[PDB]
Structure 1
Amino acid sequence: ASNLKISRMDKTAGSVRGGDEVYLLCDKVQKDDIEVRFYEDDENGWQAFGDFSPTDVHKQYAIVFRTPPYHKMKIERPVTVFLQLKRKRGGDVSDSKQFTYYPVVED
């Protein structure tokens, strides 16, 4: 039925260690049936998930979650990946958007 779409996004970049809180506005989703997936469509096939409880799904139109860490921690340059809303029931998705992982700066 209803098509998944990501309207806007709090921030679109974070550390490679992930865990950065992101506020995402979207079209009608269902607190339990929905999930946020990060991946890179290359050969590798990496994929991760946004951390959030059914509680962080605000009145069916928004999701507050935390970015999952990137599969490679020692990157040198800003790696860009895609993310998309996906249902658990159908497997359906939304036209994915992008997200950039900045190299864990020194200290």
Structure 2
Amino acid sequence: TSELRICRINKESGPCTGGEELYLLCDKVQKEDISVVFSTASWEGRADFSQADVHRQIAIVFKTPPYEDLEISEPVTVNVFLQRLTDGVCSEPLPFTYLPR
């Protein structure tokens, strides 16, 4: 027990191709067991980043994971949430929408 959460994100939309770099402020997280995840109805993607990229357990610089449908032609909003590697516990999801083109 220790509700991990995300205070805010520096961006609300990005290219559906992913690889974009963002920042997120959050409640204490152990740089080891922790991972940002983007999810939808039938899809899940783990964002890319390294242990070093977690700043004093309060923020994490990571790159958005390429979306599943790299050809959508409409703003596909998804869910963004933390999630320890051990117990699988998450965090209230944040709204991040992928962009076409």
Q: If the length of structure 2 is used for normalisation, what is the TM-score?
A: 0.96
Measured after TM superposition, the shift of residue 90 of structure 1 is 0.7
Give the counterpart letter for 2:57 in structure 1: Q
Query: 5 Å matches for 1:38-77?
Result: 38-40=38-40, 42=41, 45-77=42-74
Query: 5 Å matches for 1:4-23?
Result: 4-23=4-23
Q: Which has the higher strand share?
A: 1
Q: If the length of structure 1 is used for normalisation, what is the TM-score?
A: 0.91
Give the total of aligned pairs. 101
SS of 2:98's partner is: strand
Q: State how far apart, in whole Å, the 2-side matches of 1:73 and 1:89 are.
A: 31
In our comparison, the structure showing a higher alpha carbon Rg is 1
Q: State how far apart, in whole Å, the 2-side matches of 1:13 and 1:54 are.
A: 24
Give the counterpart letter for 1:47 in structure 2: E
What stretches of structure 1 of length at least 5 have no aligned partner? none
Percent identity, please. Answer: 50
What stretches of structure 2 of length at least 5 have no aligned partner? none
Measured after TM superposition, the shift of residue 4 of structure 1 is 0.5
Structure 1 vs Structure 2 CA RMSD = 0.8
